[PDB]
Amino acid sequence: MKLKERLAELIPQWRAEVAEIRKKYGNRKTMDCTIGHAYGGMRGLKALVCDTSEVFPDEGVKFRGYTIPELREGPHKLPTAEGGFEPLPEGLWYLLLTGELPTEEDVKEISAEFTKRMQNVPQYVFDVLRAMPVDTHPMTMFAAGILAMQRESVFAKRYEEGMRREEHWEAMLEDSLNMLAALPVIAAYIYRRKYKGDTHIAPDPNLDWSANLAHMMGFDDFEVYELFRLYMFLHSDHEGGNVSAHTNLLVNSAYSDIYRSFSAAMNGLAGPLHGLANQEVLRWIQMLYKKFGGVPTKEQLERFAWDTLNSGQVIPGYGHAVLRVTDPRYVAQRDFALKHLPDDELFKIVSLCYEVIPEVLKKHGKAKNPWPNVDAHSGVLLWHYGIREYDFYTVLFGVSRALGCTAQAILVRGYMLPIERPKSITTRWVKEVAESLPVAGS
Amino acid sequence: MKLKERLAELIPQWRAEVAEIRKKYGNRKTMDCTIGHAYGGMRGLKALVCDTSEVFPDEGVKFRGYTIPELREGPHKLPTAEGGFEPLPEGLWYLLLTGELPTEEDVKEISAEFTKRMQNVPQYVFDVLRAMPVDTHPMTMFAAGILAMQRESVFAKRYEEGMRREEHWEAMLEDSLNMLAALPVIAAYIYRRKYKGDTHIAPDPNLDWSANLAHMMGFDDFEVYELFRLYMFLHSDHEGGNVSAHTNLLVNSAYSDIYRSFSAAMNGLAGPLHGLANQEVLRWIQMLYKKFGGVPTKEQLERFAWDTLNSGQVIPGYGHAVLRVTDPRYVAQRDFALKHLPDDELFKIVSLCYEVIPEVLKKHGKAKNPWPNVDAHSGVLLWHYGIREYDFYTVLFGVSRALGCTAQAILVRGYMLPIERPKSITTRWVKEVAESLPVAG
Amino acid sequence: MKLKERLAELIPQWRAEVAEIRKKYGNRKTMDCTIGHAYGGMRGLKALVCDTSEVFPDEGVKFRGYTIPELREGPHKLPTAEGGFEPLPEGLWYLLLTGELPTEEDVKEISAEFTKRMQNVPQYVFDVLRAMPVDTHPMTMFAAGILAMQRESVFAKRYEEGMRREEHWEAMLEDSLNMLAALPVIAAYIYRRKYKGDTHIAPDPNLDWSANLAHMMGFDDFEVYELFRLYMFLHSDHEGGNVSAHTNLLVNSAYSDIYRSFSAAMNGLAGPLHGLANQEVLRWIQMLYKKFGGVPTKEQLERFAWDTLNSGQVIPGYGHAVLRVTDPRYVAQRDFALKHLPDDELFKIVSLCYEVIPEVLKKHGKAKNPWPNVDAHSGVLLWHYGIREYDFYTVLFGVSRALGCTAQAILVRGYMLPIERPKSITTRWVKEVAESLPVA
Amino acid sequence: MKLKERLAELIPQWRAEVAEIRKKYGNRKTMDCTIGHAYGGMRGLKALVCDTSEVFPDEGVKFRGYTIPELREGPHKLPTAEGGFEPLPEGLWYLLLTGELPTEEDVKEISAEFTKRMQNVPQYVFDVLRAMPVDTHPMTMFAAGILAMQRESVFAKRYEEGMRREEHWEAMLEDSLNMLAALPVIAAYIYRRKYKGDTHIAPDPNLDWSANLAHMMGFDDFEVYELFRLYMFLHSDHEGGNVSAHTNLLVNSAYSDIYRSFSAAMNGLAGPLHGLANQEVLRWIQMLYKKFGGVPTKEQLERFAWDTLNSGQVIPGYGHAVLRVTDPRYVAQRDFALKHLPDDELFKIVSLCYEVIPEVLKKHGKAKNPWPNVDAHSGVLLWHYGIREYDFYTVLFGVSRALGCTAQAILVRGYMLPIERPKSITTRWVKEVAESLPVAG
Numbered sequence A: 001m002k003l004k005e006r007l008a009e010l011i012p013q014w015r016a017e018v019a020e021i022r023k024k025y026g027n028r029k030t031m032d033c034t035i036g037h038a039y040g041g042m043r044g045l046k047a048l049v050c051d052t053s054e055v056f057p058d059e060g061v062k063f064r065g066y067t068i069p070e071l072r073e074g075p076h077k078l079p080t081a082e083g084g085f086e087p088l089p090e091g092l093w094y095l096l097l098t099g100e101l102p103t104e105e106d107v108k109e110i111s112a113e114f115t116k117r118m119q120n121v122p123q124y125v126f127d128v129l130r131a132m133p134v135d136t137h138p139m140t141m142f143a144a145g146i147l148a149m150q151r152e153s154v155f156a157k158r159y160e161e162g163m164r165r166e167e168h169w170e171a172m173l174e175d176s177l178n179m180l181a182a183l184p185v186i187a188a189y190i191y192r193r194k195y196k197g198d199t200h201i202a203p204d205p206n207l208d209w210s211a212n213l214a215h216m217m218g219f220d221d222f223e224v225y226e227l228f229r230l231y232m233f234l235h236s237d238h239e240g241g242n243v244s245a246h247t248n249l250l251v252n253s254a255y256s257d258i259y260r261s262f263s264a265a266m267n268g269l270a271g272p273l274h275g276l277a278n279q280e281v282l283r284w285i286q287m288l289y290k291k292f293g294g295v296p297t298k299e300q301l302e303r304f305a306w307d308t309l310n311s312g313q314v315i316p317g318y319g320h321a322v323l324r325v326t327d328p329r330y331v332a333q334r335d336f337a338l339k340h341l342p343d344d345e346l347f348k349i350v351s352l353c354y355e356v357i358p359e360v361l362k363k364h365g366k367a368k369n370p371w372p373n374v375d376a377h378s379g380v381l382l383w384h385y386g387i388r389e390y391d392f393y394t395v396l397f398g399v400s401r402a403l404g405c406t407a408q409a410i411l412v413r414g415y416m417l418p419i420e421r422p423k424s425i426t427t428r429w430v431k432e433v434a435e436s437l438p439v440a441g442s
Numbered sequence B, D: 001m002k003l004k005e006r007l008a009e010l011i012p013q014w015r016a017e018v019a020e021i022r023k024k025y026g027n028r029k030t031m032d033c034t035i036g037h038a039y040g041g042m043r044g045l046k047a048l049v050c051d052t053s054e055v056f057p058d059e060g061v062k063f064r065g066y067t068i069p070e071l072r073e074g075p076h077k078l079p080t081a082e083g084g085f086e087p088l089p090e091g092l093w094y095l096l097l098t099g100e101l102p103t104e105e106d107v108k109e110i111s112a113e114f115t116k117r118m119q120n121v122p123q124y125v126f127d128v129l130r131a132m133p134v135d136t137h138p139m140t141m142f143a144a145g146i147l148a149m150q151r152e153s154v155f156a157k158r159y160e161e162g163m164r165r166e167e168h169w170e171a172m173l174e175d176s177l178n179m180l181a182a183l184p185v186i187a188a189y190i191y192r193r194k195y196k197g198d199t200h201i202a203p204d205p206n207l208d209w210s211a212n213l214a215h216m217m218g219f220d221d222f223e224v225y226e227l228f229r230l231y232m233f234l235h236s237d238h239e240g241g242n243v244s245a246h247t248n249l250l251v252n253s254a255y256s257d258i259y260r261s262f263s264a265a266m267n268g269l270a271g272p273l274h275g276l277a278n279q280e281v282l283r284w285i286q287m288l289y290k291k292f293g294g295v296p297t298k299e300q301l302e303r304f305a306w307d308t309l310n311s312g313q314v315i316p317g318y319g320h321a322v323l324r325v326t327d328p329r330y331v332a333q334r335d336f337a338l339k340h341l342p343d344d345e346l347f348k349i350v351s352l353c354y355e356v357i358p359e360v361l362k363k364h365g366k367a368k369n370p371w372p373n374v375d376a377h378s379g380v381l382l383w384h385y386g387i388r389e390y391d392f393y394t395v396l397f398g399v400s401r402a403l404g405c406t407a408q409a410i411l412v413r414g415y416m417l418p419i420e421r422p423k424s425i426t427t428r429w430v431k432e433v434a435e436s437l438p439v440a441g
Numbered sequence C: 001m002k003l004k005e006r007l008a009e010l011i012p013q014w015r016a017e018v019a020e021i022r023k024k025y026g027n028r029k030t031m032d033c034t035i036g037h038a039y040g041g042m043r044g045l046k047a048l049v050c051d052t053s054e055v056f057p058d059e060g061v062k063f064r065g066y067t068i069p070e071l072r073e074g075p076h077k078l079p080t081a082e083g084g085f086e087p088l089p090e091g092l093w094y095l096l097l098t099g100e101l102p103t104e105e106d107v108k109e110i111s112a113e114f115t116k117r118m119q120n121v122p123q124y125v126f127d128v129l130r131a132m133p134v135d136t137h138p139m140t141m142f143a144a145g146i147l148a149m150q151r152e153s154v155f156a157k158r159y160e161e162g163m164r165r166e167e168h169w170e171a172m173l174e175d176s177l178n179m180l181a182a183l184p185v186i187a188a189y190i191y192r193r194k195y196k197g198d199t200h201i202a203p204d205p206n207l208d209w210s211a212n213l214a215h216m217m218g219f220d221d222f223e224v225y226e227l228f229r230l231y232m233f234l235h236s237d238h239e240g241g242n243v244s245a246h247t248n249l250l251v252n253s254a255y256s257d258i259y260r261s262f263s264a265a266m267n268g269l270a271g272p273l274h275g276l277a278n279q280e281v282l283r284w285i286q287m288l289y290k291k292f293g294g295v296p297t298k299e300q301l302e303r304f305a306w307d308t309l310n311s312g313q314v315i316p317g318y319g320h321a322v323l324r325v326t327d328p329r330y331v332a333q334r335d336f337a338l339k340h341l342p343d344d345e346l347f348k349i350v351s352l353c354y355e356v357i358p359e360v361l362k363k364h365g366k367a368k369n370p371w372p373n374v375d376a377h378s379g380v381l382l383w384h385y386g387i388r389e390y391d392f393y394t395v396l397f398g399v400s401r402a403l404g405c406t407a408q409a410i411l412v413r414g415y416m417l418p419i420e421r422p423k424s425i426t427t428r429w430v431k432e433v434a435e436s437l438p439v440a
């Protein structure tokens, strides 16, 4: 498999380079660590490594150096499905792992690997899923189902039998192949059992990964396959500092396998502060629609935005700190709606918003960035094609972000990064010492 | 419950204090952040707040200011079971939450809440546990059963009903009582199914929390109860920077409830680098006894230690970097053995090790610490009484450590600390800019 | 446990005696092995060892030298339940193992050990039984339940860890205590699921083993407790050579643990020539009662007996492989019935058969034994007290016969007897050499 | 089906021949019965009839007069798979029942019958299997599933309804066909659940019986299919007197159906001294290999054999109750290894064992047969092809041995042999009487 033969060459180089970076430049200072950082969620503190994606506050997130547009269209385009436009997550994943663009064949090998292993979800994983009351939240069911599959972990097995640190990444790749293949199956199982009368649709062995997720949920239109593919591409990764990506690295750092690290990560993604934005945006949009008995005019939408902001509320999906431009992930999805559903009422509102809202956020002047993010666009897309089960949206997210998390975990284990072990401090000590302490600088 | 009425008075005070500390001293620098932290798992980086316990290099861990001697023996001794000597975790928990020492009444209220609530483990939790093949690792079973119980989360439900941040700690507390009550039942269920022929022993409503775990695992000797109480006490908390306590805090920072954070924390505990040390020690002691056909002499042990150190190995249970004195958690456990099982042979090796290994580690001069930690003593105690299922040792650990994780989670949600969102950096950026960075100093 | 302390003395002794026998007398001839033996199910062949019991053609079974009357009536009467008359099987089991008569206190130890270990049937055993469809034959359910419990086998675990032959008996004893405690629980569960609407009754912790089976099956009655005690006493053991006992020895001889060897045995007891006769007697008694609208005359019964034989059938409950006199196991149940239900009409038919059928069978002139065996009497007792689930009768048998199976397997492992592996022969060889062989 | 048409003529002939023999040659003496026989496991005592096969002390097994070479290569080579070399068990079975060598067409009739009925394993058997904890030994799982399926016995249903003794062999044949079809499915379910992540592969209707078992286990190489064919053939049958065959006859004799008689026989095969030796052989080789970190010297193996003897353990894979020479089932398997895997490490240890272990057992002086048996060789063959789960090896044996068990049960109910019921004797009797008894010569 190209993906592995390649990683067999690159990872020992990278390991040597990281060893060199630690020895030679370990003592280079990047910043001051303050009291503020400890009480402030480490916000700003350069504490983590991640090589799969990087946010440039001018341009947006980039995957191994490449912009999102570049990878969606033009000579840098990632391989599609036969007769498709949208880039397959399978090829995206190859990129995150190798830093290199995959060929057509490279991607067909990953799709085949995911397809073959998609048949190897253990029966007991379903037994476990069926044991959970049906009204359990989908993110609980999802994480639990992932965790139960831990019995099949090749990393745990091999760790216990005795394996060199040099082989960690190989076992992590093998487990990641297995778990990634499992996720559409588990997710679909949950979807079907909760929402669609407990009727189960098997994988089609001719579909790519994302499309199979759609097929197994019960959607077979070409457009939905294309949506799923795009969705999975865009949401795959976003640095390592978000709660879910961080949890993954943290639990991985103790040599806990991907089933443990990833399911932990999902427990994190399930949190209301990490995993709900998509849904809140959508719910808002639909409230607008109900309020104005249809699409509002440019004027009505300005009047509403002003009243929202003046009673101290936020406009969902707009105005998050890190960027200073429009999220490429938003732009990609706008592009998709304009092509395949331009006359959708709820999307018209989203389109009106893209025109109005940043003009209102600029003249209100409370947001240093007035532009939308990826979560501003996704909801209407799902809803249009009849995926209307808000709670489940976070599962879809989780399915995508496993691309990032597995790639990251394979790499840091390839690099042989040590256990994540910050130092906590007590308020007792803060109060003892704070006066004696230098201000940030000197 | 006094604990609640008390937290009602204290947590607003602590919330206002922490606001003030952030405003007035946020800009105070504690240390240099380096490349080395980012590629070194943040070793040393004062990035977290934990007010439940603190490690002093020259004394050991302290719980809310108080040493282990103070609480176990000393002038501030925590309430025991009737007839008992060892401190009840129920009172330690009270202390971790309030920073104040419990009365006998306070401990009984907590004991009584854990007992009542021990009857409220949903049937579906057992269904889930049973659906897992019996040869599944017990820490996977443990974390999965806890996670399944997420459906009963009061936090989760109240968050969606819409609730002020001001009330977070109350929901966290409620869930924390339910979960803690459930942990012994889940852990016992796993033990009985895997190791004891799938026969199930119900909670005794007259036993404290620790004892009930022993009871439900099928051990009713007073000494065993006393061991369980001590164990649960010693292992309850060790700062917030360790993987499990950190995982707990991290996932909690997203407003995920205690079942999600604690199950996640347990996935980290399951990690070979975090959860196995007392087993490794015990097997080490067990190998010595096999090798010398009994307790080695001073001289056999010294040779074997020097041989060990001269092939680049470490001696398990000894020579950890943070302490510079013997871990008081080790001392308390040695005190227990000397008193209750002094002729146990594996104990005799452990005790001999206490004399011999520090001397060999001083002479060898490589260790900045020649002394043992908790993990060097805990195995032979468990094994003495017939808890011999190595893999399950991490579950006992987990049960104890829930006392600390719950306390820390209740607290930081009282404080209303924000989400944990550090910044990641690229090797690409480091390789570019490293040469142009100042050196720390 | 006195039982163990005693076996700890006795088995080393017996093992040395058996060694001595094999060395000094191994080549001592007992009988001729013939072609009839090989094609005739080994009838008469002294091929096996059993020290628990011996079946005398002209006297009946003896348990370690002691007759049923000796142990039920006196002058060597075993301990009873408090206020009971019937011997407790706990006491019989003690005697089968040691060859010594138990004290009262020795029997309470065993009762208390069964009661304690009764609480230790694994949940997964029930899981297994519930997965069997409810119309499954109950002997199928029984053997499966026992076999599933093989996962808790101490012999199996210890064998793998490494143990010398001398230690086998101790592992066999531990498993036998666990399994024997389990059988009443498993039997009751099957009974209650099949026949009593799937409601389940726990062990009562102040009942002996036999009476706990009755209790858990739903019958709380002194006479019933007494019947079960007697029943379990009587079917306990009957030499080494019957199909169930022999199956147990055979599978045991390859170092398979008691769950394997006993479940195998129950597969054999489930067989129509070994375990169904109780039932066939009852049905035949009920047929008589229906035809003649009550208890028949001696004339009506004789006709019906002749009509049974002319239609090519056996008269059930009569005859035996080796017995040639009235089975003492029959007589003991006759005494029970005379005492507790002498006006019961089915019983009346059974009693009338005792006077009439032996004459019929003597004249018929085929049967080598014209007298009743145990199976002639058991059904009408069970039926009288409200146990009417015919197929389940063989389970009760199974629970009892466990007593002798456990004792024998423990002993033979104590002795360290080797694997049972006789030589087979072909019909081709026989045909070629038969003329040249000597006669016996 | 030719098989049945042929049995319908042959069995009445055999029935009558038997009846005549019982009548005419009942009192023919074959040998003396001794105290030795009663206390020595009947060793040598001609106490059973078997017509499928006969084990010669000095040559090993013959199936209906034919040797293994004769049927595998020799002038009377059984039909293979298309493009195959190894003989198919389907044809050996036809030989066992009829005494006649099958055609191509007769073997395809049986293969097709197995294939068709492979689909008819009830759902409840799989429910029973899953109800068992996954760490249950395979041989217990195998026996239990077989036993659960007793519900579908035609013989037990027809017996309960009233059926003549003459229709017995017919009901036994119908049941055997169904059960034999079931055993690969049942065996493969156990293999998959325990060892391959609880995913399940359906039968392939284009495969013969042995190959389909591999297929359903997860192994599809031709050489693997060939190994299974040879394996199922070699372990089919071995006289009446082996513990499994005899347990089957014993239970059969009370009119218990094949599901009861064969599950019973499997509880006997599971014994360390019987079929479980194929597992024990590999466990023993493993301990060897670990002790000397690789292929040991002659001296190291010598020392190792003796240490197992001196610790009161058996050396698995050597010895036999009738064999007094190297087992031709062994020689056959060696042949297979030399051809297919001559350089395998484990195979080298087995080859070494063939020189050394007989030498040890001669000097030790107790074994009547110092040479290897079938179970010495079988494990290494499977291990080579990636079937390394040695606890499963006795299940494969069982699937094969069902062939012999079914052939014998059908025949003996055709002959109408009676219940097996030898006489037991007491030790008390032996003491009193022994001095008076004649010495046998």
Ligand SMILES: CC(=O)SCCNC(=O)CCNC(=O)[C@H](O)C(C)(C)COP(=O)(O)OP(=O)(O)OC[C@H]1O[C@@H](n2cnc3c(N)ncnc32)[C@H](O)[C@@H]1OP(=O)(O)O
Pocket: C418, C419, D043, D272, D273, D274, D275, D277, D309, D313, D314, D315, D316, D317, D318, D319, D320, D321, D322, D366, D367, D368, D369, D373, D374, D375
């Ligand atoms: C069932 C099958 O498929 S094949 C054979 C069984 N499988 C095994 O490899 C088990 C190991 N082998 C043995 O135990 C024996 O050879 C068996 C199982 C065949 C038993 O057969 P027996 O006829 O009782 O053996 P044999 O007549 O040689 O026994 C005489 C003595 O030799 C010993 N002996 C025989 N084979 C072995 C052996 N492989 N290792 C150690 N001791 C042995 C016996 O234990 C006995 O010792 P004892 O006098 O202290 O009781």
Ligand SMILES: CC(C)(COP(=O)(O)OP(=O)(O)OC[C@H]1O[C@@H](n2cnc3c(N)ncnc32)[C@H](O)[C@@H]1OP(=O)(O)O)[C@@H](O)C(=O)NCCC(=O)NCCS
Pocket: C277, C309, C313, C314, C315, C316, C317, C318, C319, C320, C321, C322, C366, C367, C368, C369, C373, C374, C375
């Ligand atoms: C138990 C039993 C099967 C043993 O049979 P056995 O060892 O073959 O007995 P015998 O040596 O007395 O058999 C000789 C003949 O008498 C016949 N016979 C024996 N008992 C008989 C009976 N109760 N009714 C009719 N005929 C009988 C046999 O069928 C045989 O007939 P055959 O010569 O036509 O073949 C036999 O006595 C019998 O069939 N009994 C009835 C069933 C029963 O109640 N069994 C309980 C067993 S504890």
Ligand SMILES: O=C([O-])CC(=O)C(=O)O
Pocket: A421, B238, B239, B240, B241, B242
């Ligand atoms: O005891 C532990 O788990 C280690 C620990 O607390 C820490 O390093 O902070």
Ligand SMILES: O=C([O-])CC(=O)C(=O)O
Pocket: C237, C238, C241, C242, C243, C321, D421
């Ligand atoms: O003894 C026999 O063979 C038949 C019998 O009565 C029994 O097994 O109890």
Ligand SMILES: O=C([O-])CC(=O)C(=O)O
Pocket: C421, D237, D238, D241, D242, D243, D274, D320, D321, D322, D373, D374
């Ligand atoms: O064990 C026996 O006696 C004969 C046999 O099956 C065997 O070698 O498998």
